[PDB]
């Protein structure tokens, strides 16, 4: 049943889209010392999962911030400076976010190829015998 | 289409705004009694249903650099500079008191 392939590729494409949006936010918030409520932005990362026990769909199970320390900068005249004159900025690393942009896009496009190829195989089964 | 186009567009637009804010400071290097404007970015998450993956960044002016400026000695009686921290009370053309 190739219709299962559609579920797996669709779940993979959804997972890559979540990863791409996470990368988009990290690049946009790699220079933000402030935040909406009260907590400095930390590089977010989606968590993929495989519930192996046919096909095993890939599901995103939540967003987890990176555990790297916040990059402290000496801005003593800044309003938000601490007692030592340090301000903290998000731990977003440019090199790894660019790799995620490349990896997520290439992984997204190859799952479309599988679904398109799997779509053809179902059609040829319909034409079998006639 | 993916909403990441607008998530990145909204960041690129704000980076231009911060660039213009820094441009005004460089255009006002020689201005008398000019306090440079500070620029930063704020992260505002898009709260709602779904995975928390979309956060916007918008620029703001948290404050100004209130440090003492570069004092120019002119030898003129009607030229004064504030020592340390302070302000001079003036009213503009609207008769509204403001510090200068």
């Amino acid at each position: 049943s190739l219709f299962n392939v559609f579920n797996v590729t669709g779940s993979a494409m959804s997972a890559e889209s979540v990863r791409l949006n996470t990368t988009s936010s990290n690049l946009a918030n790699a220079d933000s010392v402030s935040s909406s409520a009260k907590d400095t932005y930390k590089a977010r990362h989606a968590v993929f999962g495989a519930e192996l026990s046919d096909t095993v769909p890939v599901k995103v199970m939540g967003i987890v911030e990176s555990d790297k320390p916040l990059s402290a900068e000496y801005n003593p005249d800044h309003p938000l400076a601490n007692e030592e004159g340090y301000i903290y900025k998000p731990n977003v690393n440019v090199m790894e976010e660019m790799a995620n942009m490349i990896s997520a896009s290439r992984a997204y496009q190859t799952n479309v190829q599988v679904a398109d190829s799997s779509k053809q195989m179902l059609l040829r089964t319909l034409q079998m015998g006639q | 289409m993916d909403r990441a186009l607008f998530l990145a567009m909204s960041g690129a637009k704000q980076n231009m705004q911060a660039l213009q804010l820094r441009a005004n400071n460089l255009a006002n290097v020689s201005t008398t009694g000019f306090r440079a404007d500070l620029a930063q970015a704020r992260s505002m998450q898009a709260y709602g249903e779904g995975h928390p993956s979309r956060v916007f960044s918008m620029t703001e002016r948290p404050g100004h650099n209130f440090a003492q400026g570069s004092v120019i000695t002119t030898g003129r009686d009607l030229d004064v500079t504030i020592e340390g921290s302070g302000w001079i009370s003036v009213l503009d053309h609207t008769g509204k008191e403001g510090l200068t």
Partner: peptide
Amino acid sequence: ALSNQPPADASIPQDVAQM
């Protein structure tokens, strides 16, 4: 996933305390 209640609109607040 399908539901009977329409999905709520996102907020994106400038300051969370203001709400």
